[PDB]
Write a protein that binds this DNA or RNA. Structure first.
Lengths: 93, 230, 23, 75, 97, 274, 98, 79, 108, 96, 80, 97
DNA sequence: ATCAATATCCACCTGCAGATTCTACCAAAAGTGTATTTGGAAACTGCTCCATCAAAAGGCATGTTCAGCGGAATTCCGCTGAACATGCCTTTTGATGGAGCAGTTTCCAAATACACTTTTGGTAGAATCTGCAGGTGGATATTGAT
DNA sequence: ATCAATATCCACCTGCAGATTCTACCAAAAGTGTATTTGGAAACTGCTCCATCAAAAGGCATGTTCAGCGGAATTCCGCTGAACATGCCTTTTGATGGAGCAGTTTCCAAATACACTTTTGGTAGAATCTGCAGGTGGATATTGAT
């Protein structure tokens, strides 16, 4: 019993040019990548939700957090597509 | 409150405002010493041999009972080297002489061996002395002290007195069950008191015999001088 | 009449010198 | 048991010996000039010849236990 | 019209300055600067004066680290006169990108 | 005790009881041998050695001879009977050493003194044939036949410069016995002023494990029983306080004999088994 | 249909919801934020994968080994600021000859 | 508008003697102002983030003290 | 002396329950230890006592009995045990310590 | 009008060190920020520790090892020893 | 328990400087790079073994050394 | 025999090894080293070999950071060899505490 | 080397904030007794992995050789800088008008907990695939001495 | 400007070493409906804490003007780099001995959630001594001209 998104990152790899393979220790290195970017945003979520003086785990401070940790233009349009994603989730009404 | 760490500083001035006498008939000698420092690589049981020295008691049947007129000569400092011979001479091959007091082994089966026997390579000069030709007098070591030019050897008195010595070994070694008159130690138990030979070590043995030889020759410098002394 | 082994030993030591501790 | 142990203790009781050897040829080979000007009256033929005899004796004690192991290990 | 060895008052400046601890900059030039460089993220932004002084001593700690850094960098280079690429390698070698 | 000690010039009672009279609780005088120190209990077993002796000191081979005394290591894994006689010499006073094994391995640092007629012994200090602690001195014993001058001191003037060619750390063991402290932490205190009158730059107090070859936190204890440790004015300050102003000059003006570290011919030994 | 299928992303929604569950502290959470928080990792990780393909047109090397994985992960220059705490196992260093 | 030089040569030599340095390059100025504006823009950017999530058009000290807490030059005193 | 305790037992110098909801405001998981989380008192009373005696140190140093910020740090960035534990912790306007490099002075 | 504060407690320990040692409100806020910031950082580190150990009751064992970790062992040893002192006077489940 | 100073290994710098981009070495840095190496490893091992006694664990994991490098300051990748 | 220029062969090893990403520190010296650094402070703790490779990469990443910044330090120092007070300066400069 | 010249160290008056020090109200608890999941030490319990040991080349390593520009530096020439000096910008400390946040009220997506029903991703099994990393043969860079 | 032995690029050829890629399985967190709540949205409003300017003093710009220090050229010389002989220790690749694991059941103080309760810390603030920064004075630490 354990966890990773190995086929999911493979799904990303076939969203681009699918034809490549990946060396199978760099798979652990990219699970390290997704793990530490996730705990980075998780810890930053917890702390900014702490010291914005609220208790519901919320939205717009997570938005600003994942902006402010991240290099700029990719943060900008990546969160733009993320907003496109949450609106296409929710807008399925 | 702390024990400190390293690197620190310091400041000099400012305002935080029955004399003994018996080295005469026992002790003698005089010792020289130079910038050269005196060398040793031997043990002392070599140096005294006989690990035994003894009392008035076992010589009052010897000296002042008889020794006006010993028919063959029985001096004091000869009794030691003869009485030192035989007990080792049954030691490296009979251990079981000790635990059982009814059975110390006797000289009546020790005759044909101990005339020729060996107190651990005893005449060890001769396999070097048979070539060094120093037999015109007797052989003396540096661990030979000055007590023995004036003495006698051993193997010839067994023709003369040899069956009157061990007779007094027997009757005092056993009342502690098997200890010499000077007993050894807290010797028995540590509780309380009271594929290499193919290219390298083929050369094991030569690298001494090639030095066991020319030492005679660098000493043949002086060993040829003993007629320049005459 | 006394030198009969005195007469040769005093160069051969340099040969043994050049034998085992001269490599 | 093995010749290396009897190699090495004959390097380790030889922990004096080449240092003996590089000492030994000097203290006499120094004063071998004394006789060229001796051209005193009891001793030095006897007492100064002692240490040469134990320049001859000091190597000799190394042999009563070793030399049998030359043949008993090659069997 | 008399003067000692030229320069040695800089050690006096060390004494009076590093013995001291106080603020340096005229506050309002720093204030007008930071309002000018707050316009280029969002209009009508106000600021805490205590935070302004925090900004002051923060960049002060930054620069004094840089000064001691470049000092011993130049003095490793068996010289003292510091220059651009000295603080460039001091920047890359302390590490802000 | 048993059978009070007779040798030399002084008359002594044996302080600890009876390791040597396991067989010998049956005689009256105790007479002492010196060079190889093999004694005899009843009388005439001893005095036949004057005609026997050729060895006239403990047969050490020397890195040392001053004008005055002599110093010896003996290789202790080499020695067998005389590696346990000096233990048996040690026990009748000094019982402080560990006898779970009738100790063969451990190494010897022994002292005897130059004379024409004979090397009259003083006693010694030891060393284990392991090395984990640091082992600066293991087991002092001086015998009270020869006790009174700075020769009893000179044991601890000897150990550190063994670690000037061995150059590693030396460390006292858990048998912390008393009266050597009137030497040890006395002499280990004022090694500081040997380094303090020099190095007028900042004292990096690890380097006394390279300068004194001694551990700092212990040597600061004899420095803090000296109380030489002020601080918090902006530094730690060792503080020459002006009580020192005589006592180094006391040892600038009334000095005694020394040695010299050129006079050593010995390689630091590493041994074999594991 | 499903949770992920309404957002149409690839990552499973409930797992990141769970992975924002067990790290959290605050017991209550607008779950629709997960549907972009699912994508909070995503485009950043979809960035780095296809920008690991530079030689991949002209090498015909079909697998991405860990120096090659680094050999244009460093060319994520902007995210070397994100990688300023990074150490890659068997990544190497780019030749920087001064 | 342009007031980057107001932190000036006597000002920077005072805070240079805070670092102690003596053989001052007088070509230091544009780049010491450059690393000045570099550092201040790096800290004011996330101070702006930490005030802009607060729905507050002033900047306090607690938002900016988190803004320097997170990045690696945390500072004390103002909360 | 009294049978009513204020958790009056620890040799304590701090209110326990306030720091217990200081635990309960980090509140990631669900279960803590109850009394043995009041080792945060002896956690907290360690280092404040580590500095106030040192801050007692620089009082009669400058013969100066009310104690101010810029020699809190001037001992702290001096204090080898507690510079490093809080180097990144930086203080308001205490400056740094006066150090002159030794290779700079050539007696000129 | 509503702020958690510390100041009386540290002032009490400062006077029970020495009855005459004054402080400022600036240095008050400074060591205030000191004490709570070090409290939050040991809180974060201990919390992460007890999390990743796969254990659910947050113990003195985890923060005991954590103060051996996060704090250097001279004053960390000081702290653990005073903790033993403290827990022995937590040990009496008593009236006295 | 055979310990001595086998830290005296090798000028592996004569490879690490080829992984380095530096010109000439001329050695002599060896004891102090072993000092900074031993400082680095002693710092990480006190962290690691405090963690493995925190698990009551005799061995070391790789999560241990990951988290140890994380708290001291660098992020190992891919070993849990 | 034929001898190249001392240094362009080194440039070949530079290109070789910047090109390389092989496993740097040999296994068994490193692992009995981490054995012997482990046994001392407490009971002789067991290992895992992947974590030994983590130690491998840890110390080597540590030193390639140190070797690149001492590279720039030496080459701006107008020498090009490497010595002690640069690595002292670099340990200061990387902020050891 | 001997006074002028600063410019520092120490110490005695002086007007504050102003810490601080105690009082004072009361809010909000800490600390309390007790019910309860519940997380937890641990005993069992097989075992992976951690070690000792075999054993023999192989790739490195540690030799000594020796020849060499890299560095350490000092030189005579050169200079942007630092140090007392004259005129000036503003900043500093004096002075007044608004929003906004901080709080206080209410209204509902929305979440937890439960209680259900699935897919699908975990292990893992190994057939087939092929990638690629490694080895081998012609054409092409690459430098030291002449 | 040129010889010419070393080293690498590029196409061709292969062992095998995992990879992937499903088929199976399985078991299990996940999606979703329903109830309670509840925390945030957010709208109103009060008077802090921002906003802005007028007089001196003081940094400061700007000198002027020589200099300790930079500073490349040139110098010696060194400890190392290339290279080559030879010990010789890792690194296997098995072979094996044994244990401190990582579980899964395991019963059990005890944290932890409920609400009384009596101090008592937070703020709120006033008394008022006094600590002390700084003005003033005395005496002198450090250092120039000739």
């Amino acid at each position: 019993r354990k966890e990773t998104y190995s086929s999911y990152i493979y799904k990303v790899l076939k969203q681009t040019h699918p034809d490549t393979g990946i060396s199978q220790k760099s798979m652990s290195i990219l699970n390290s990548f997704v793990n530490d970017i996730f705990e980075r945003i998780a810890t930053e979520a917890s702390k900014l939700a702490a010291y914005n003086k609220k208790s519901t785990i919320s939205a717009r401070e997570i938005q600003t957090a994942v902006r402010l940790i991240l290099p700029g233009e990719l943060a900008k349009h990546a969160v733009s597509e993320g907003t496109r994603a949450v609106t296409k989730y929710s807008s399925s009404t | 409150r702390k024990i400190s760490v390293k690197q620190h500083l310091k400041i000099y001035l400012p305002n935080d405002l029955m004399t003994w006498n018996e080295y005469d008939k026992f002790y003698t000698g005089s010792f020289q010493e130079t910038t050269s420092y005196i060398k040793f690589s031997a043990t002392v049981e070599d140096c005294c041999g006989t690990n035994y020295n003894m009392d008035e008691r076992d010589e009052t049947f010897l000296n002042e009972q008889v020794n006006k007129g010993s028919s063959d000569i029985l001096t004091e400092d000869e009794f030691e080297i003869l009485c030192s011979s035989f007990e080792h001479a049954i030691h490296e091959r009979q251990p079981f002489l000790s635990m059982d007091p009814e059975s110390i082994l006797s000289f009546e089966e020790l005759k044909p061996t101990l005339i020729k026997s060996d107190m651990a390579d005893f005449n060890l000069r001769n396999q070097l002395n048979h070539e060094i030709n120093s037999h015109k007098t007797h052989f003396i070591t540096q661990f030979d002290p000055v007590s023995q030019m004036n003495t006698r050897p051993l193997i010839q008195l067994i023709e003369k007195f040899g069956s009157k010595i061990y007779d007094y070994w027997r009757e005092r070694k056993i009342e502690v069950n098997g200890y010499e008159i000077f007993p050894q130690l807290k010797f028995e138990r540590p509780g309380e008191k009271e594929i290499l030979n193919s290219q390298r070590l083929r050369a094991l043995h030569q690298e001494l015999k090639n030095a066991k030889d020319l030492a005679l020759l660098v000493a043949k410098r002086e060993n040829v001088s003993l007629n320049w002394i005459n | 009449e006394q030198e009969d082994t005195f007469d040769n030993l005093q160069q051969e030591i340099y040969d043994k010198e050049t034998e085992y501790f001269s490599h | 048991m093995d010749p290396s142990l009897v190699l090495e203790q004959t390097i380790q009781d030889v922990s004096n010996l080449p240092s003996e050897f590089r000492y030994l040829l000097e203290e006499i080979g120094s004063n071998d000039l004394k006789l060229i000007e001796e051209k005193k009256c009891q001793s030095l033929q006897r007492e100064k010849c002692v240490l040469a005899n134990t320049a001859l004796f000091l190597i000799a004690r190394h042999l009563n236990k070793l030399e049998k192991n030359i043949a008993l290990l090659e069997e | 019209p008399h003067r000692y060895k030229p320069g040695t008052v800089a050690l006096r400046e060390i004494r009076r300055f590093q013995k001291s601890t106080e603020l340096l900059i005229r506050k309002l030039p720093f204030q007008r600067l930071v309002r000018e460089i707050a316009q280029d993220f969002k209009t009508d932004l106000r600021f805490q004066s205590s935070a302004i002084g925090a900004l002051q001593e923060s960049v002060e700690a930054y620069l004094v680290s840089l000064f001691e850094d470049t000092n011993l960098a130049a003095i490793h280079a068996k010289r003292v006169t510091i220059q651009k690429k000295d603080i460039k390698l001091a920047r890359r070698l302390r590490g802000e990108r | 005790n048993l059978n009070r000690i007779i040798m030399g010039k002084y008359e002594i009672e044996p302080w600890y009881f009876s390791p040597y009279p396991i067989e010998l609780t049956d005689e009256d005088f105790i007479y002492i041998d010196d060079f190889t120190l093999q004694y005899f209990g009843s009388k005439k077993q001893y005095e036949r050695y004057r005609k026997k002796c050729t060895l006239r000191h403990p047969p050490g081979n020397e890195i040392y001879r001053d004008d005055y005394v002599s110093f010896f290591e003996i290789d202790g894994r080499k020695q067998r009977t005389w590696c346990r006689n000096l233990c048996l010499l040690s026990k009748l006073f000094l019982d402080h050493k560990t006898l779970y094994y009738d100790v063969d391995p451990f190494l010897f640092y022994c002292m005897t003194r130059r004379d024409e007629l004979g090397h009259h012994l003083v006693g010694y200090f030891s060393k284990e044939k392991e090395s984990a602690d640091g082992y600066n001195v293991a087991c002092i014993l001086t015998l009270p036949q020869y006790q009174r001058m700075g020769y009893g001191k000179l044991l601890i003037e000897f150990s550190y410069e063994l670690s000037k060619k061995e150059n590693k750390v030396g460390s006292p063991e858990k048998p912390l016995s008393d009266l050597g402290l009137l030497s040890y932490r006395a002499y280990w205190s004022d090694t500081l002023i040997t380094l303090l009158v020099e190095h007028q730059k900042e004292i990096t107090i690890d380097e006394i494990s390279s300068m004194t070859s001694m551990t700092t936190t212990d040597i600061l204890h004899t420095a803090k029983t000296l109380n030489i440790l002020r601080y918090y004015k902006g530094q730690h300050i060792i503080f020459l306080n002006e009580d020192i102003l005589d006592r180094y000059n006391r040892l600038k003006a009334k000095k005694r004999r020394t040695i010299d570290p050129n006079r050593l011919i010995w390689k630091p030994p590493v041994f074999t088994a594991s | 249909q499903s949770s992920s299928a309404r957002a149409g992303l690839q990552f499973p929604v409930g797992r990141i919801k769970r992975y924002l569950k067990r790290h959290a502290t605050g017991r209550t959470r607008v779950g629709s934020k997960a549907a972009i928080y699912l994508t909070a990792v995503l485009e950043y990780l979809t960035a780095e994968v296809l920008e690991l393909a530079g030689n991949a047109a002209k090498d015909l090397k079909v697998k991405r080994i860990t120096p090659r994985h680094l050999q244009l992960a460093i060319r994520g220059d902007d995210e070397l600021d994100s990688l300023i705490r990074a150490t890659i196992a068997s990544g190497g260093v780019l030749p920087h000859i001064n | 508008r342009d007031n980057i030089q107001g932190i000036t040569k006597p000002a920077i030599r005072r805070l240079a003697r805070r670092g102690g340095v003596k053989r001052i390059s007088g070509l230091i100025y544009e780049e010491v102002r450059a690393v000045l504006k570099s550092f201040l823009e790096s800290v004011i950017r996330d101070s702006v983030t930490y005030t802009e999530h607060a729905k507050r058009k002033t900047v306090t000290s607690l938002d900016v003290v988190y803004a320097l807490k997170r990045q690696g030059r945390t500072l004390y005193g103002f909360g």
